[model samples]
Target: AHLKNNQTLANGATVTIYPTTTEPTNYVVYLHGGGMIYGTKSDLPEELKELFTSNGYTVLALDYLLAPNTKIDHILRTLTETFQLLNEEIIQNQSFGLCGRSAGGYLMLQLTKQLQTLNLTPQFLVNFYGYTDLEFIKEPRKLLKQAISAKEIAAIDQTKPVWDDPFLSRYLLYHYSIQQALLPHFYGLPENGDWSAYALSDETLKTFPPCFSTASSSDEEVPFRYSKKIGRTIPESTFKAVYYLEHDFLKQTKDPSVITLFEQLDSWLKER
Candidate 1:
């Protein structure tokens, strides 16, 4: 009931796709977590697949090049191309909804930004505890500074498959220089400089597909304010707020909220 394939982009980036229950009544383009430096498309756990497939949907979960090595611009560009390739596979006029968690949630927004350039639109967007403005992330960076050492930031350029390196993946999420590693190299800007260019502007949110997003007030990773901002900015969006759920809270817990969350998303899709 699952069809998996890896397609190589023109630029040589590889994207892995998993088509859930190939009868394919509907489709979802999914991205995975791991702070953009870890995780894989295959990381779409079985429960999440059940959430999508149970709704008569096939999921296209993708993988892309990682950051701090792959420039943020390049990572987006690669997925942009990957989306185009997947768009071709869907029967004409059949659109897939977009979804993700954690870093994948962030990329869902970023990927939508890229999709705009080509006039591509997903049926809808569902973000589970994803962030909006990278600028707001600066707050978390401050706390990360106390625990991050210069030696660790210095070691970033040397790691291979950074996610496999525990300290490099989880620790860098707390490190102050993380944004610089994600952005500056691509923009030719000085480290720790302006990152406003990558932010989701109010103007951009105006044109987005109706989005359904959720975040917890107590998420320790990306601040919940990012979700609050997105929920408020996008005109046709729905934002659900919960208390005390950690980052990736849906994946970590079995609370009824998880079922309620996807049920709401399915209703949104049907109503839209």
Candidate 2:
């Protein structure tokens, strides 16, 4: 029988596990990206799940706290607790891996960097178009200042402690009632330095488990440049590998990106 979703981390977080083969010592955890606003494990592409279990690796997905609902710090804390629980209580047989996309990928890389500060490391890491620097783009205040609808923006109470900006009423962090929880610097901050301060940097590249990532040539959330930067930092060893694929025709071609994701993931798990 598969293990039920009853497992709770030290911090009262729940982790859902998806079964693979008859014997599963290794696991691949999924983290979905919604730009801190809209996505979850259920949102994971079906083709990806079919690919992993068929290849013989248990798949587990985490439901971490999100932005606007709980705040950035809280998400980081709970996520930390999840990993800590996994290390201290969840796994005993084989090494672990991480697979996340877009905003999900952002969390993965940041966690990979932060996990190290706490002395945690997975056996493998896979990112699918995750944005490394939320702080990169120049402030759109000039455009948002004139463009965003004031009718909607002013609807948010400017005095709410959970939020510092006048906007961002829809962030996911607002779900859990953590007192004084707030957004991470990258998502709501005013500068790249602030983002780099909290998020993983090019300097933190070596701080992850072996990584395999696939990004599209035409990504908007996570531009292809950041992947290039990361690729330049990592060694060619079996530990870190990256592939940048074209998405022009693929976007309309059944999203094989999802299939390619898990297939490559399975290959990595086997090789390592």
Candidate 3:
């Protein structure tokens, strides 16, 4: 019973919506993860479509300007405005849910803090392997950057272009080309005093929505300890640390642990 529609915001952002009906009903916002430098709303994972909408909820998949074209503050502002627009045009004061994977998960965490500033919060949140503290992970970012240099990226984009397709560009080529390059563009250097501007620290977590998250022990892109800290910071949040799943397990596989994670999320959302 999913009906699809696409719309553009006044600020030129776009959203693809999967709704169960014409009215607002039970709605959720989804942000796809590509480190805020890659990927688009068109790349939403399949499991999300199955888990939320199958049970009669609606999904609003957001599309924002990539980091090279915009700053982190602007990115989050555009996302906040997108939700505000949705709140006015679609939901009309009805409560809604939020969810994200990877970079989207980070955005989700940041957005929760933003909502709190405005005295609003989502009914619940589902985050998959998103980091909370950007300043705390500089060493890994450096290692990841060294593994694939900016020079190599320029060479690949100029001489070896294999990222023409949406799927490959988003999931494969972008990984090496722009991987962690866009983070500092928004958050600034790890040494900046304003790191807390985008980070989800213990103080920020005390009032966030009830959250359910999944992180992997072997995720090289983002350390699994990020999720562990989030779980610990938010006393009510339940986080699962998976040993077998990869970083993109939510999109790449349907392992038992993955299924159970969503099943528990579905149960929690139902009760919420």
Candidate 4:
């Protein structure tokens, strides 16, 4: 049976917890990716959930407010608070790990710094096609086929947290921001501001937990170079560069390569 619990954060974001059949030895928190513009905790795949839970892990799929409507700092604060709550209430005294894809992967990297302040360090980190630098946003290789207007951008409802963007309407905003190089502005940073602060430095990366990362060599969204840099920089990291695949390739769970990737992750977790 699927034994689960739901938690609501003070910011109205939510987490769905999936506990293992027996006592869980560790916890794995998952974050989904939608360029920080759209996505929900429910986006966690059932196969992936089973993979962790069956391996004696309690999984927490976390959610935060989407961007444009919410700034990056605010989103980080909300995630940090959620981690605090998890530490104090949910999984006290147990070790935990973090895994995320795309924007979610980027957030996990950022969140680790905040977690250090609380003396909490994740045992491991799994980043799938995540970027370590924000500079790429300023120079998108491709633009949206159609241009988005100010009126359309302003028309989006920003009143509450957006758990999902079923129709990808929010993605249009992200595309527009990338095309116009306004992502930093939407993140509440100054236009043409120094974004180096948002990026993970080699010094900072050296302090990271054992990391497992993967990226498609042919990724059109976030470049493979980011993952390559991370894989090479971190002292205890395993970076896998897959070929002939698109970004977020894990969603193709049935693919042989993806299956092998999960098996490798399982073995890696076992070692940890």
Candidate 5:
């Protein structure tokens, strides 16, 4: 059975719930990765959907306002509000976990404290190529060969609920932002330039739930060091490092490694 429901948030964001055929023992809230620039809740792959559903998990894929339009503060606020609403309304008292890849993973880490404030803690957190440090944004990268022009940056549509960019137009904007070290601006960083507030502290890591994090050792976008540190710091964490794969290697669903990764995750979720 293909049972699903769409929840519209107060801020015009949305969450799509894919319920399992069998009674769900738990829920998994999924977030997508697009450097907070572009992505959609509907991007969850069918294989993953089946994995979660077959394992008795009802998956809720979440979407938020993209960056350079909504800013990080508002995006985070929207995510927090979604969780609050989920607690109050739909998934009331049901056990849930957080799973995100790349930027979404970063968000999952950031939301730990907020979840605590709501007296709601995730049963677990699964991170795929996500980082805990915002410092990487300040560091220079050579991803783009050509510099994007001012006019190109100005022409972007700064509208809310830009959940998808099937053409990858927004990805160019993201690439330019990273190359120019303009991501901090898009994130709405304070003038004082204290990134520590945004990064996960050792104290915060101590409180994180059981975590299953994986990253590519040669990830060009997000450095693997951050995930390594997180794995070492968090008391109960399983960190897997795959070599010679892209940052979002999980997208290679047909690959042997990716298949193994999912199998491992399935077993882990079963234990949880």
Candidate 6:
């Protein structure tokens, strides 16, 4: 029989755990990707689980709240629950890690920045084609819209439900989560100015833990430069270890779309 990922969560949220055949040595928290708007723990394709787990590490997946309908503020609570859950039932030596792909990857990256603020640190971060700069840009907006449709917009009425439920008719399209309230980036930011206070900053960059990043050369939602810049900021030792895979590599024709990322992670974990 298949090894089912049992579900549990703090509050109303849900997180799933997929254990290895034998006792788990360490934990790999896998996040779902839907641009923070649409996704669930089940979003992860099954084949990847077998490949990654059969190798050794256990996989823990979290189901974060969706956007537009669900206020961005909820992300903190959802993730906090998920993070606490990961450390549960594990010893200090087993350690902990994180992994995400696409929109999930970006959230994982952004999450690390936020996690640092709360003093919740994990062993390593593995990202697959995630977004870096949350700052507004002209072209990225177009792609964001493409990823989120107009009809979905009507589905979201934060007051009606006061909660995000993608299963409902309301659309959950949230694009306003990252900008600083006082120093808004909607219009633009001065050349020297930065969004560090609210998002990733030089200070955070300096202290970032080990990380691995991958983005497609042709990925419209995220630019390779974003990953490159982040990678460049950290010391060569701690800088963003990135994968400039084939353009649109995640959706490769053969094999799994997530294989490239899992392979990189497989190696990263093996080296440790």
Model 6 regions lying over 4 Å from their true place: 89-93, 117-120, 136-141, 144-197, 235-262
User: Model 1 over residues 154-245: C-alpha lDDT tens digits?
Assistant: 64553342323323344463243454443344323346667776677878888888788888887777788777767667778998887766
The TM-scores of all predictions, comma-separated, are 0.78, 0.71, 0.82, 0.90, 0.92, 0.71
Instruction: Residues 194-254, candidate 4: write the lDDT tens digits.
Output: 8777888889888888888888888888889888877678778888888888787867989
Give the least accurate 10-residue stretch of model 4, judged by summed lDDT: 159-168
Mind sharing the TM-score for model 4?
A: 0.90
State model 2's lDDT. 0.56
lDDT of 5 at 108: 86
Rank the candidate models, highest lDDT first.
4, 5, 3, 1, 2, 6
lDDT of 4 at 77: 88
As for lDDT, the candidate ahead, 1 or 4, is 4
In model 5, residue pairs whose N, Cα or C atoms come closer than 3 Å (at least 3 residues apart or on different chains), thus clashing, are none
Number of backbone collisions per candidate: 0, 12, 0, 0, 0, 4
lDDT digits (tens) for residues 24-115 of candidate 2? 45777778766654445555555665555666667777767655545555566667777777767766536677777666777787777777
State the lDDT of candidate 6 residue by residue for 1-272, as single tens digits. Answer: 23665655445555566777776466777886655555466656665555457766677777676554444445645666556655554323366667776656666766777677767666776666665555533343333333444554554554431222335332234443221131123223344555443355666666766666656565555676656555556444222333444433544524454464556555755664
What are the runs in model 3 whose C-alpha is more than 4 Å off?
A: 21-24, 141-194
Q: Largest TM-score belongs to which candidate?
A: 5
Query: Which structure is stronger by TM-score: 3 or 4?
Result: 4
Between candidates 5 and 6, the TM-score winner: 5
Global lDDT of model 6: 0.55
Ten contiguous residues minimizing lDDT sum, candidate 3: 156-165
lDDT against the true structure, each candidate? 0.67, 0.56, 0.69, 0.80, 0.80, 0.55
